[PDB]
Amino acid sequence: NISFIDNTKLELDEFLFIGDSLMQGVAIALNRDLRNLNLKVTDLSKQNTGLSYKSYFDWSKATNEAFIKNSNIKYLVVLLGANDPWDIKKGGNYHRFGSPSWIDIYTSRVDEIIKIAKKHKAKVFWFEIPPVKKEDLNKKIQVLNKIYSDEILKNKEIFINTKLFFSVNDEYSAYIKDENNRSIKVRTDDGVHFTPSGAREMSKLLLEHIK
């Protein structure tokens, strides 16, 4: 499940945010940072969504429709997957999480999103999901992150590394050190989401890919 360190920086223009409640939290901080740069933001992030829940809410359809409504969107920001690492049933066909056919389906759903952005001539920033507190869930999200990074690499878009920045001694931590080497609570007590400070740190990681 090993990825790469993405050193890509883009020169900047409207933004579109998609994803789940992780994106909803990051979006509060990232909207403010982009607003400070006179950048327009459309934030569609929506709780209880994910690529595995495509039949309930299809992010590929919603993203395409957003581009059709606003041809000035040139950057897509994606953060999702917290709801996704579970078996998928399609009709009478069953796909166990992490199995080869499951990975095929999930990879296709990731690729759909990137293909739609490319068709509309937009570039993609895709966030790595940072570590979560529950060990079994954390192992599964590392599988998701490998798929995101593989598909972002093949499509030559931008992968935002988050694992190192939200770990202490290569493990989940609710607290990290700030720019002044002081301890700050960046994760909420559910061991998944972000405090305002954590959201700001996630936003900074995207901004470090913009020149």
Q: Class in CATH?
A: Alpha Beta
CATH topology: Rossmann fold
Going across the major beta sheet, what is the strand order?
2-1-3-6-7
Q: Measured on Cα atoms, how large is the radius of gyration?
A: 16 Å
Ends apart, CA distance between termini:
29 Å
Structural class: alpha/beta
> CATH-wise, what's the superfamily?
SGNH hydrolase
The tally of helices reads 5
- Find the count of extended strands (DSSP E, 2+ residues): 11
> How many domain regions?
1
Tell me which CATH architecture applies here. 3-Layer(aba) Sandwich
What is the chain-wise order of helices and strands?
A: EHEHEEEHEHEEEEEH
Note the overall shape. Answer: globular
Beta-strand percentage range: 15-25%
Structural summary, described in words:
The protein has 211 residues and is α/β, with parallel strands linked by helices. The chain has a single domain, classed as Rossmann fold, CATH 3.40.50.1110. The protein contains five helices and eleven strands. It has a five-stranded parallel beta sheet, sandwiched between helices. It has a two-stranded antiparallel sheet with strand order 4-5. The protein has a two-stranded antiparallel sheet with strand order 8-9. Strand 6, helix 4 and strand 7 form a beta-alpha-beta unit. It starts with 13 loop residues before the first strand and ends with a helix.
In short:
This protein is α/β, with parallel strands linked by helices. It has a single domain (about 15-210), classed as Rossmann fold, CATH 3.40.50.1110. The chain contains 5 helices and 11 strands; from the N terminus they run E-H-E-H-E-E-E-H-E-H-E-E-E-E-E-H.
